């Protein structure tokens, strides 16, 4: 929210952004039931809702096919992909031997119960048990003697009410071959994401932030298919865990440094251009700039791609050939005119005799710029016009 100009290196630093760092994963195990429609009074009489049960049967068939084909590829964010391997590994342990049998026994009366694992990692298990409450209790005697769909008019519509979830989730799993990079509203719904995150191994600090940004919590969580066991669907979903909630963080945006006299445009050029954050008194650097997303003030980051840089690297802001920490900066004359879109302003460097000036879109081209790097903010100007490539500036103020 507060940017300063580093005229020594033609760089800007913005220092008003807190951060939230992801640390772990909170596994949840889902157990949905499809009822008893595998073989229940089909016969051969065409009807309207009979064409809805065969859809459920085909959903079961495709859910079995995709589950069988899931264990065929296992023949021995990019930085977040290291977590996909862990999610695959944890699913393999649960799906084998009789761990599911113990899991199923754990929820034989209660829809929610925390269950352990063979490796001791705590895992949460949930069961909906809603479809069986209608297909077995409110549908069994209605369809009798194969005389289908005639002695009712309201329950015909209500059958599609308790059918959307299974169809949607089986379509998703068949399309994505088991791995779902997004937690859709079909797999997990509301009252199962404020309840299945409030049992995470963290403190009261980050849980409130997760409850407020459940949207991006969904955005960063992925699920996998465990398998089909009898008339039941088994699958699990991974939830991100945020270790810290509020640590100082800042951005660095670089550009060509300067020019030199006697017609020799020879200066330096920084290639730092990232974010920094602190975890345990040791600032960590993300080598890429497309690694974190700003949501107001806070910054959301994952502690699986950042690089820890040794302290005393603090004085990369002062570039006087410092001896303590050699900041990694590329060398080369190679003048390239460019404009760096800084958050609260703009950084401009044009050298090769190209006209550069600012424009507020109402006063016109006023205050023509100079050859050297100058700082233009989004209040003294609104655009930085070069040729016909007018650049806009953000409306956020700080």
């Amino acid at each position: 929210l507060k940017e300063s100009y580093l005229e020594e290196s033609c760089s800007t630093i913005t220092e008003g952004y807190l951060s939230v760092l992801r640390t772990g994963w909170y596994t949840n195990v889902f157990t949905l039931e499809v009822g008893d429609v595998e073989n229940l009074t089909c016969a051969d009489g065409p009807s309207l809702i009979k064409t809805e049960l065969d859809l459920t049967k085909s959903a079961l068939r495709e859910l079995r096919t995709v589950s069988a084909d899931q264990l065929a590829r296992e023949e021995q964010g990019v930085c977040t992909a290291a977590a996909v391997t862990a999610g695959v590994a944890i699913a393999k342990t649960i799906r084998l031997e009789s761990e599911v049998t113990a899991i199923k026994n754990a929820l034989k009366k209660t829809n929610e119960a925390v269950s352990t694992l063979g490796n001791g990692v705590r895992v949460l298990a949930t069961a909906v048990r809603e479809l069986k409450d209608f297909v077995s209790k409110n549908l069994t005697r209605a369809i009798n003697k194969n005389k289908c769909d005639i002695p009712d008019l309201k329950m015909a519509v209500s059958f599609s009410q308790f059918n959307r979830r299974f169809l949607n989730v089986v379509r998703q799993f068949s399309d994505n071959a088991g791995i779902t990079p997004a937690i859709s509203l079909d797999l997990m719904t509301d009252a199962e994401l404020a309840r299945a995150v409030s049992n995470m191994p963290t403190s009261a600090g980050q849980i409130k932030l997760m409850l407020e940004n459940r949207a991006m919590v969904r955005r960063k969580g992925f699920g996998i298919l465990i398998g089909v066991y009898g008339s039941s669907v088994i699958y699990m979903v991974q939830l991100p865990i945020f270790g810290v909630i509020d640590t100082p963080c800042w951005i660095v945006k670089a550009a060509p440094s300067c020019s030199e006299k006697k017609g020799n445009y020879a200066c330096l050029l920084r290639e730092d251009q990232g974010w920094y954050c602190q975890n345990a008194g040791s600032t960590v650097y993300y080598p890429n700039e497309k690694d974190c997303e700003t949501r107001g003030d806070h910054v959301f980051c994952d502690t699986a791609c950042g690089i820890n840089v040794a302290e005393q690297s603090k004085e990369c802001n002062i570039n006087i050939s410092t001896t303590n920490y050699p900041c990694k900066v590329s060398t080369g004359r190679h003048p390239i005119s460019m404009v760096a879109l800084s958050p609260l302003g703009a950084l401009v460097a044009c050298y090769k005799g190209v006209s550069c000036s600012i424009g507020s879109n109402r006063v016109g081209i006023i205050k023509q710029l100079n050859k050297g790097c100058s700082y233009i903010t989004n209040q003294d100007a609104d655009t930085v016009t070069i040729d016909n490539t007018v650049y806009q500036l953000s409306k956020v103020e700080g």
Partner: antibody, heavy 121, light 106 residues
């Protein structure tokens, strides 16, 4: 208590080289900015330059070619040397301690000295 | 270069909240800190980063930063302080304010 003590001459003839020295008791570590602040009569504070623990100098841009700031870490002290001193440079000189890493890195002056008066005649 | 311009005198009745404006050009974009210098003695820091308070300063010493004016607020002023409150905002030159003389009327 990382106290500051500034000492030196007190009377410099014009067109000579004033010298001063601030001695720190409690650690001149590579964690604080060591800067000189002067206040001419009329009570307007002016900043001359700061000294970081490594070679890192940055002076007031109306006062370059005249000010030199060095380090004497062996005795835990740092000095200064003006040049072409004139009657306009009669001021009380302070040596102060600055923290780091909350604004660009440079941040505000945590503790100051006691102030030695320097007169030119 | 740049110059932080602030009023040179502020008269405050005892027990009433005091506000000292420090009008820079592009302020709020950069961090601003304040100082307190009683007569004779060397100055001592009061506020830094516009909201913080380093060590031992009484709670009735707060600041803000909005638009182009950073304001120092003293809630319930007393006769104990009649210092010279300067500003500071690093623009590669450490521009200082012109100084503001609080008068609690003695």
């Amino acid at each position: 208590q990382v106290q500051l003590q500034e000492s030196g001459p007190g009377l410099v003839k014009p067109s000579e080289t004033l010298s001063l020295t601030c001695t720190v008791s409690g650690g001149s570590i590579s964690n604080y900015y060591w800067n000189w602040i002067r206040q001419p009569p009329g009570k307007g504070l002016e900043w001359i330059g700061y000294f970081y623990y490594s070679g890192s100098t940055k002076y007031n841009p109306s006062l370059k070619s005249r000010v030199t700031i060095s380090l004497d870490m062996s005795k835990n002290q740092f000095s200064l040397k003006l040049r072409s001193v004139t009657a306009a440079d009669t001021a009380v000189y302070y040596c102060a301690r600055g923290t780091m890493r909350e604004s660009g890195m440079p941040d505000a002056f945590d503790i100051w000295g006691q102030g030695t008066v320097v007169t030119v005649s | 270069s740049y110059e932080l311009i602030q009023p040179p005198s502020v008269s405050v009745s005892p027990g009433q909240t005091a506000i000292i404006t420090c009008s820079g050009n592009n302020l709020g974009n950069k961090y601003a800190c304040w100082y307190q210098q009683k007569a004779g003695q060397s100055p001592v820091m009061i506020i830094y980063q516009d909201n913080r308070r380093p060590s031992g300063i009484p709670e009735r010493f707060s600041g803000s930063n909005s638009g182009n004016t950073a304001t120092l607020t003293i809630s319930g002023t007393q006769a104990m302080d009649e210092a010279d409150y300067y500003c500071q905002a690093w623009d590669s030159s450490v521009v200082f304010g012109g100084g503001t003389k609080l008068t609690v009327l003695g």
